[PDB]
Amino acid sequence: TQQPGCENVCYDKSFPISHVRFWVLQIIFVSVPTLLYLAHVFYVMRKEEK
Amino acid sequence: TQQPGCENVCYDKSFPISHVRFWVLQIIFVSVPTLLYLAHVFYVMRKEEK
């Protein structure tokens, strides 16, 4: 279209969220429980040590 | 504006009627009564002749 301002609004309507950023959000959310468990068991071991 | 289709619609809103065409309409409308009178008196003279 020759309408200025149509590209990105159509792009934005096409792509609410970019796939790479969405997958980054997915992997970071999946990784969080593992990091929580690792830190928690590490603190448990340190407290058990004393 | 970068909006395509804005020129002529703004031009059209600006110029409902072009001045040259409007004056042509004015002068032709003014001239019509004179031509009517000339033809009418000419026909009157021709009928009077016979």
Curated annotation (Swiss-Prot), chains A, B:
UniProt topological domain (Extracellular) ranges: 1-21
Annotated TM spans: 22-42
Annotated compartments: Cell membrane; Cell junction, Gap junction; Endoplasmic reticulum
UniProt PTM: Sumoylated with SUMO1, SUMO2 and SUMO3, which may regulate the level of functional Cx43 gap junctions at the plasma membrane. May be desumoylated by SENP1 or SENP2.
Tissues where this protein is expressed: Expressed at intercalated disks in the heart (at protein level). Expressed in the fetal cochlea.
Assembly, per entry: A connexon is composed of a hexamer of connexins. Interacts (via C-terminus) with TJP1. Interacts (via C-terminus) with SRC (via SH3 domain). Interacts (not ubiquitinated) with UBQLN4 (via UBA domain). Interacts with SGSM3 and CNST. Interacts with RIC1/CIP150. Interacts with CSNK1D. Interacts with NOV. Interacts with TMEM65. Interacts with ANK3/ANKG and PKP2.
Function of the molecule: Gap junction protein that acts as a regulator of bladder capacity. A gap junction consists of a cluster of closely packed pairs of transmembrane channels, the connexons, through which materials of low MW diffuse from one cell to a neighboring cell. May play a critical role in the physiology of hearing by participating in the recycling of potassium to the cochlear endolymph. Negative regulator of bladder functional capacity: acts by enhancing intercellular electrical and chemical transmission, thus sensitizing bladder muscles to cholinergic neural stimuli and causing them to contract.
Disease implicated: Oculodentodigital dysplasia: A disease characterized by a typical facial appearance and variable involvement of the eyes, dentition, and fingers. Characteristic facial features include a narrow, pinched nose with hypoplastic alae nasi, prominent columella and thin anteverted nares together with a narrow nasal bridge, and prominent epicanthic folds giving the impression of hypertelorism. The teeth are usually small and carious. Typical eye findings include microphthalmia and microcornea.
Family note: Belongs to the connexin family. Alpha-type (group II) subfamily.
Protein name: Gap junction alpha-1 protein
Lineage of source species: Eukaryota, Metazoa, Chordata, Craniata, Vertebrata
